[PDB]
Design a protein around this ligand. Sequence first.
Ligand SMILES: Nc1ncnc2c1ncn2[C@@H]1O[C@H](COP(=O)(O)OP(=O)(O)O)[C@@H](O)[C@H]1O
Ligand SMILES: Nc1ncnc2c1ncn2[C@@H]1O[C@H](COP(=O)(O)OP(=O)(O)O)[C@@H](O)[C@H]1O
Ligand SMILES: Nc1ncnc2c1ncn2[C@@H]1O[C@H](COP(=O)(O)OP(=O)(O)O)[C@@H](O)[C@H]1O
Ligand SMILES: [Mg+2]
Ligand SMILES: [Mg+2]
Ligand SMILES: [Mg+2]
Lengths: 147, 46, 535, 105, 526, 364, 139, 75
Amino acid sequence: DGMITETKGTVLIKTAEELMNFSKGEENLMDAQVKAIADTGANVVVTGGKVADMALHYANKYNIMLVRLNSKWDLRRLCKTVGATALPRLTPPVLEEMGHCDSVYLSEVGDTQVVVFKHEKEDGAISTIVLRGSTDNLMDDIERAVD
Amino acid sequence: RPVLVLSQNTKRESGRKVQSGNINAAKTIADIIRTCLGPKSMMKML
Amino acid sequence: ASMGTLAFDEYGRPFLIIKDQDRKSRLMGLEALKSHIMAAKAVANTMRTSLGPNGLDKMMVDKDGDVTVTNDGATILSMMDVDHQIAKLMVELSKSQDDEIGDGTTGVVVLAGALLEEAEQLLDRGIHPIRIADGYEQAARVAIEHLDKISDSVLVDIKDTEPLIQTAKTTLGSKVVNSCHRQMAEIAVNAVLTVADMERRDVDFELIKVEGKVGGRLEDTKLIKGVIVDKDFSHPQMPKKVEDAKIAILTCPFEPPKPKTKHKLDVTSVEDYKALQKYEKEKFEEMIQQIKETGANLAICQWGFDDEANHLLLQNNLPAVRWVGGPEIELIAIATGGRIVPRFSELTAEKLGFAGLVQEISFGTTKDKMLVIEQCKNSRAVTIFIRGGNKMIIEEAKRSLHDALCVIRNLIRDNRVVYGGGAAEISCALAVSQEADKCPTLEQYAMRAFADALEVIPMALSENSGMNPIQTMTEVRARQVKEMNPALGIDCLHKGTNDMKQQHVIETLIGKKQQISLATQMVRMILKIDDIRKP
Amino acid sequence: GVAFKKTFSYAGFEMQPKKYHNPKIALLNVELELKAEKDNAEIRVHTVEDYQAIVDAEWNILYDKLEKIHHSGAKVVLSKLPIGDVATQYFADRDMFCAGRVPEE
Amino acid sequence: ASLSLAPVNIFKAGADEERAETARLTSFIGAIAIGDLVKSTLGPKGMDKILLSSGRDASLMVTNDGATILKNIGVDNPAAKVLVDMSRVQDDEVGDGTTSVTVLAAELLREAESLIAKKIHPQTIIAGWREATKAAREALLSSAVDHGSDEVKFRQDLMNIAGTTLSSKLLTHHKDHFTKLAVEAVLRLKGSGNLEAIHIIKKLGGSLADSYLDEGFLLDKKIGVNQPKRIENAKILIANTGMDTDKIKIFGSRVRVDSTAKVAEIEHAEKEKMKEKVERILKHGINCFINRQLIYNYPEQLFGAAGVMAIEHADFAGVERLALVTGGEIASTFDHPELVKLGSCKLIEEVMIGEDKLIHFSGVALGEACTIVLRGATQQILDEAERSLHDALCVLAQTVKDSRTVYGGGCSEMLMAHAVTQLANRTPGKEAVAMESYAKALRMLPTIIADNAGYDSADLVAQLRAAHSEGNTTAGLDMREGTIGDMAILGITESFQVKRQVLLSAAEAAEVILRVDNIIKAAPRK
Amino acid sequence: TNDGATILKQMQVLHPAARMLVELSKAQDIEAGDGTTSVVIIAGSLLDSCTKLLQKGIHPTIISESFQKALEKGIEILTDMSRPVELSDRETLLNSATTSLNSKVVSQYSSLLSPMSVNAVMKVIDPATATSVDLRDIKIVKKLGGTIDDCELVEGLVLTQKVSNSGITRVEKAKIGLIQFCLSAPKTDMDNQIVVSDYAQMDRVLREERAYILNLVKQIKKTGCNVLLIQKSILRDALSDLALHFLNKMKIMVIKDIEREDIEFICKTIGTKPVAHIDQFTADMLGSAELAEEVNLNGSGKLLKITGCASPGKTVTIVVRGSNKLVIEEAERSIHDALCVIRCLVKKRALIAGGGAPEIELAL
Amino acid sequence: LDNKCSVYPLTFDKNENMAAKKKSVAMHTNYLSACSFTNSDMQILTASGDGTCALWDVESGQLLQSFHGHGADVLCLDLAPSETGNTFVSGGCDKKAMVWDMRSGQCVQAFETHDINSVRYYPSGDAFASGRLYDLRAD
Amino acid sequence: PLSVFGDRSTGETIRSQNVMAAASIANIVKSSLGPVGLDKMLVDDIGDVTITNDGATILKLLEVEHPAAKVLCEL
Ligand SMILES: Nc1ncnc2c1ncn2[C@@H]1O[C@H](COP(=O)(O)OP(=O)(O)O)[C@@H](O)[C@H]1O
Ligand SMILES: Nc1ncnc2c1ncn2[C@@H]1O[C@H](COP(=O)(O)OP(=O)(O)O)[C@@H](O)[C@H]1O
Ligand SMILES: Nc1ncnc2c1ncn2[C@@H]1O[C@H](COP(=O)(O)OP(=O)(O)O)[C@@H](O)[C@H]1O
Ligand SMILES: [Mg+2]
Ligand SMILES: [Mg+2]
Ligand SMILES: [Mg+2]
């Protein structure tokens, strides 16, 4: 989303033209930022915070996959496994900071819906074991064995 | 109104716990008067 | 057999499986079915005395002490404070019949009770309940096909409302408004026919406003081809009657404009104060002059207004009414043919509605005034103004008129009718019995039980009318078999004839089909339950 | 296709036609009603003409959104956000259909 | 099986249902108890009750009105609730007849109980009662007499109607004085039905005969400080403006300056604005000024300096009544003096009534608004006098609206009962029995009227029945001594609307209650 | 108390008949002001007779009609046995007041209160034209301390408010002015704030506020006013401390927190026209008075007395003092009874003998 | 025992800092169900156990209008969105919430679908919390 | 329906309950069978101690309230 001041924000409107142009200019700024991000070649965007409606709309317009990760541990692990740097602002990423994954898709395993960042090489920083089972307790025991 | 095959106040204990408890009880009874043996024994007040 | 299971293990150590298992209950097997059948039979037998023209009302009292004297089955069961789950299923069945059809909400309960009562004796002979449900479904299919076969079609034209009037009269015959029977049927038919899409499309009940007010007599209930508003002219000195009124519908309060956004207007000098005062005065004068320029004779607002606007409206011979509700604004706009204008600057002559007469109505020694808008050109909205001697008959008249409107709506959807008075049920029972003879023996019992259950409606009508149930039903069935006439029913009103076609006892085919279908499905659902686990 | 329940229509909804033979549907996520421009917005004016201009500007913002929707050729307007009475009457005047607060699914 | 007498329990805790015997018994007991309670307050010799509230205030109220008696009681029987609501609706529709309708409904339900005991289906009773009601209504309509054409005869009818309405109330002590009072008050309305235009002022002290109708109008407000206390040939200007700290309706407006000199300038501008407002008001050339809302100190002193009497805080009713009595226009803007009509009266002054000071308008222009002063020895006496006048005024207004009149003193009841009996004698079946019970209730009404007087009710009712069967259609009870007499000669008349409403409402409510065969109660909240 | 109305009101009677007797007593107090106990006793005796009448088998309506006839005859008898009076006959008024005061606790002081009550009633009405007396024109002030012998009739105005000024407590040849606005910093009805952006604006604000207050005080003083009454104000400080300082430096007594309900009484008493805006404050709206001083009641409080006015228009004040609060309240009630009796004489110019003579004659 | 609050801030002892003008009308006594101060501090709305909403003026101290029509006592009441003629709701024990307007002194709108004790206007003003949500524009 | 002042169990419930009671009684004494069986020690809630292996004695000392278990005890 469009970053705001950390002190306090107050849209000071003094003329009718400012009132009629504020929202339009804000939307145009969001569109420009999203298009700038997309023009680098990025096609998957992962954010640690909330997703604004206008930002989501403009990401959908430019065919960009959006994944939101609440935990910062997950964000750092994703950066490790993909090779990307967590940008602090919404600037487009430079060539060194854009991580690459050989396949990202939405899938359903059993009942739960999952998002998979899948490589094809037999390497990488992080490897994941998907544990199946008929009971939560059984999977917990298998996880203890894996540990 | 429980079924109560046995009476409500009936308690059952079985297994290794029973044997350990019996042997520990005997050991405790022995330890009560362990020191009251021999010419140099000490008296007790009851 | 109750409370579930209790063993505490064969080794004496505790054996607890379900939380609070010692505080819960469990019914299993056949006795659960018997309890459910007994509860449903109790509900149906309570309801069956209110079936037919000679039905008797039930006086329902809620938790607050308010009294509701009514004959509608769905209302009675809705206000009934039940704890048994099967009784709740009966209540939901009545609500379903009311929602889908609007009439016959009492017949479904009696039919379901009869079906479960027969299923009881079928179960006592060792028949699996699923077999009973399957036989009931088969017999219901046969009965529905027979209803389609013996159905009759009526004309739903606006130039001949006699069959529609007869159907509405049949619907209203069991209600307290049977004193004004023909007038009630007339107004219901006219209301439905006025607001309806003629290509057999839907009837929007939001375009029918049912309004009640105490006083007067029940015969004073009338259909008004306009809108009756619970408001009055804002200024007490405004004229109480406007004729050929050019109506301006507005949703902007007659006040100085106010931005929605957080706004502060700064007054920094005496000249600023004078300019602000002049701006206020000029906005008031300008809005009134803009209303006047369109040629309007009457203004309706939704959000009220203040003293300056009130006196300006009075000074310019512009009668006005304020604080009219949103739905009433919509109804007035629809009836008068005028659009809804959100602000004065957008108000033009072509957006004005037209009403042949706008009047303020008093109600005796009550100080209450209610506005009337009528004599519209081609009004597509109606209002039923119900009078009476007490609030209770007013509510009962409201629901009876709703039943009549629903029946005419069903006729609009499908114009096939079946003669009532128990004739349809008797013919269906005969058809089911005939089809049961060809059936293999095992489902024959279920089909015969279904026919016997269908026989309950004429028996209930006979006992409510004081006649002997079994003798009358047997004679009518014999006459139906002897001569090909599926219109012979129970002479509840003692008119001297058993033919419901001359008696003009008319029921919609959709209503009977829905009754049979819903009763069969609920009976199957209850028959399929064999376990109860209340806390 | 898709079917869903009617969602709390406002005044003037019953004047909208309830059948179309080849409609174009505008699926929006937009609040079409007069409201504060932004939560932290704050208007400061010191002149009555500026006051009237601000009021007309709010109205013109709403009407500009509505005109943009109407000129698209759509006949059915569906929104995830509330659609006000003003927008409902505006669409009724154009023989359009509107339904706000549609569930996201 | 029954919903309650079944092995499985189908109800919540506290839910209860009452089948045929119990439902009919409860309905009949409740209705008969209500009828017995409200009766004995019927007819010229009826008595009054005492209503002791059990609340914190413990309000005390003595009254003869049936509707007020039934309204302020703790009723839990649902049929009694039906009868109470019927009485309230009867009061709303017309002023009088609240006791008669309740007594008639109770008697009808008692006859219904007897018929049910005689093994008669309630549907048959209802059909017979519907036919009887139709016959009785037709007879009553055929017996109505209209005098609205002749002025003197109509005034005599108004006199008789007011007297008959007041005869049963506490005002019967000064019936003649109060009858003149009420008829004059109603006739001053000039045909308008606005009963709110008649204001009743209850002032303690003095005798009941001291009550009077002011020839002009009386207001219970106050005059400003420096303003005159007496105006001759007043020129009224009735207004509904703010006239107090009058703030601009621009609600976001504020004063944001950089010095206190500017704040003082703005304050002077506001004061000058109010002064200009007062100057615009005064440009109408007025002597008096009534405002609905408050008048603060600055406009008050401006009016005082102008020598104009300003009356503040006269509520909506006050300004409406002043406009009706003086002909002024309730104005809220003063940019057009020539387009606003001014009220007028010969004199305005302050008068003492008891220990309170009131503003008196004398020689009013229109006068289509009355003030009635009520003096009494106790508060309860004052309240009952106000209720009695309300009944009389309502009946007189109805008679003005519809001039058809029927004879009272049981004459109408005898006539309707005779018509019902004639219909029943030609009707076969148990419907004849139901019709006869209907006639029995109708005759039981004047029976109770005579019983309340200690007279020989049976003999008088038999004489009335014989006279009405013979053809003496105007015979009725003569309560002066206890014989029968000519109601036309004796001048006991009643509004046809009131009697028709009593008949129709009583029959309808009896039919509604009779149709009930089961009473089901949800679990109470408390 | 000895007053019947007060006795019946204070004791919470629960039977409805007793409640209606209380209401009857209130009505008699309203219409006459005396005989409040006698009317209740008469009603009780009448109903006591009705007991035997009902037991003899007489319908209540007959009893009521006969009682009405008896009442009409009794009114005729009482009117016949009375004699006319003239308001110029002071002896009759004094005797009526004394007879009113005989039954009350202030009976040894009747020699002081009866002429006091007669003077109070005569001073607030026009004897040649008055047809009723508005007792609200007579103000009664209760101050603890002293003895009922110290009760005083003040021909001017008595205010319980305290003088804001210290050192100015006695003004001769006073020119009282009544103010309904506030002497504080300017404040408009609309929302107002002063925005400061420079350091100079701070002391400019201070100086301009001081100048505004000083101009208000100078305009007030220019009219010759020396005693100032300020109406009680809310939402705005009626009297700023700086305004009080300026007024004190100009030798003007200041009394504030004047109640709104008392404005009419004050204006009627001392002939002052209230002023709501400083522009209209002129000399012609001042009320000239002979002396306005604050007296001390021997350590039992202070009173502001304005005695001697150029236009003493139909208004008098009574100061009631006593040893303890109960006797003061009873003295106030008794003085009110005496005033009500003189009011009765004003309304109906007819005098009748007392001591049970009307009752004995009526019974016979 | 039961009170333990007789020494409440009634004293209001300060250095006379312009806040001492608390008015404290309390003329009607009875029970002060809701002493809410109007957004414009000119007026006070008070509800009593008799079921009548009362409007008072702080300056004059006089009862402007007594709003009657509620079935039972009004337990709670609110204020207008900002001022808007103070179109205020009133929730009581009669299960009904209704809106009043002093420009006419009448119950402009009414709602009955629930005792209401937690009324609160929406910031826009088109609705209000009914602790539910009633829409002004659709009734 | 029955209106019997008591509790009723019918069908598989009562059969399984009886089997459970009999199984509990059997499990009480199943551990005192054969040469490798072990004796039990019964405390009689007043301090009396009975050490025994005989099945009849164990079943007589125990207080039982389920009638099928009583049947096995008398057996
Ligand atoms: N005049 C009549 N003669 C004979 N039967 C009638 C007559 N009017 C209605 N009925 C029958 O009474 C039955 C009950 O109708 P009613 O009580 O009005 O609604 P519901 O079907 O909900 O009970 C209907 O099945 C109808 O066939
Ligand atoms: N002077 C009279 N003589 C005979 N009958 C009277 C007289 N006045 C009233 N009535 C009768 O008394 C009946 C009851 O009227 P009333 O007791 O005043 O109260 P309500 O009209 O509310 O029942 C009326 O039907 C009327 O006919
Ligand atoms: N000095 C007196 N001698 C004889 N009778 C007196 C005397 N003073 C008062 N009365 C009588 O005492 C009665 C009661 O008077 P009082 O107690 O003063 O007031 P109230 O009449 O209200 O009780 C009066 O009727 C009066 O006639
Ligand atoms: Mg029906
Ligand atoms: Mg009467
Ligand atoms: Mg005395």
